Ligand binder design. Structure first.
Ligand SMILES: [Zn+2]
Ligand SMILES: [Zn+2]
Lengths: 120, 120
RNA sequence: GGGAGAACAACGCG
RNA sequence: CGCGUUGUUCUCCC
């Protein structure tokens, strides 16, 4: 429905249709397209929490921006799963993503069977 | 009733009985005793608002502390009236003044006629 | 990654 | 002085 942009450099991030919610907190982003739009550097200090094990940090790929976008994690069998930081993004036109969520219907809950279809 | 202490150095500030509220926001402190417990240096940037004209900044007199306590102002005919910064103080016992206010009854509203009695 | 907490430095309105 | 906002640091829980 609505598009997210890098809060810092406003480059296209992803669509709300491509987001899923795991355990009513974490925002992950489906599709291999998205992965072209960020780069990753390894985590200084390891943390596992919830289902997740942390793998790396996400940064806007725009070299002049490198805004902190979130982390990648392994959840269940799904590795290199990008989880985005909701304060790091804004919406196309203006308002930020936090605000947007508050006034819109819930995003889709992550569905493992759907996920097993996209990443067999 | 309850005593306020310099948040930084814990030196005795004033009693809650010596505080008055002007326009449901500003906390001023009666009595010439109090004035011995802070020092002032003129205000770096003069601003009038509400009734007040700013005169100076307040600092804890303890030379090793000099915590920012608030400002002095002229209101109506009353010059060099100390207004304290509620985040700068804590309560004897520990909790801070902000917290204390939230769980206690309202402090006394400033009364100009009372004030005309103390400072004729 | 989400939820809180405290500190510092500043920006805006009165 | 109140109010609202930012950046950063430290920490807790998950
Ligand atoms: Zn960017
Ligand atoms: Zn002090």
């Amino acid at each position: 429905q609505k598009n997210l942009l890098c809060g810092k450099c406003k480059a296209y991030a992803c669509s709300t249709d491509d987001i899923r919610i795991i355990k009513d907190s974490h925002h992950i982003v489906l599709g291999e397209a998205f992965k072209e739009r960020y780069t990753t550097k390894p985590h200084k200090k390891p943390m596992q929490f919830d289902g997740f094990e942390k793998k790396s940090k996400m940064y806007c790929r725009n070299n002049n921006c490198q805004h902190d976008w979130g982390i990648t994690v392994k959840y269940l069998t799904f590795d290199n799963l990008p989880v985005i930081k909701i304060k790091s993004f804004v919406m196309e036109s203006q308002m930020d993503f936090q605000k947007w969520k508050s006034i819109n219907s819930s995003l889709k809950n992550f569905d493992v069977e759907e996920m097993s279809n996209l990443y067999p």
